[PDB]
């Protein structure tokens, strides 16, 4: 029941744009439930929003390994790669996000 509260704490801090503390409670959520792709995704979102694209790529990767149908994650890892000047993997991720968009 308990990463149902950590995730929500992280969510509540995310919703208010407090990424530093959002990360703190997203990481606690991931300690208890290391399988929830949604946790990997939102933690990926938090780093991305800070401009920590290196870590954003890292965490989106596993969110996409556990849920490859997450088109939003594909797209955001695509921006991350683009920011880093990785234009090949950016293209690669962008297309995969659009193939899930009718």
């Amino acid at each position: 029941n308990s990463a149902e509260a950590w995730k929500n704490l992280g969510n509540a801090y995310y919703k208010q744009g407090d990424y530093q503390k959002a990360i703190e409670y997203y990481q606690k959520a991931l300690e208890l439930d290391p399988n929830n792709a949604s946790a990997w995704y939102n933690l990926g979102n938090a780093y991305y929003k800070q401009g920590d694209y290196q870590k954003a790529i890292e965490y989106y990767q596993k969110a996409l390994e556990l849920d490859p149908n997450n088109a939003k994650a594909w797209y955001r890892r695509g921006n991350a790669y683009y920011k880093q000047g990785d234009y090949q993997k950016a293209i690669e991720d962008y297309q995969k996000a659009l193939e899930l968009d009718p």
Binding site: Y14, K15, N42, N45, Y48, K49, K72, R76
Partner: peptide, 5 residues
């Protein structure tokens, strides 16, 4: 700006 699901 980006949303959340």
């Amino acid at each position: 700006m980006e949303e959340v699901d």
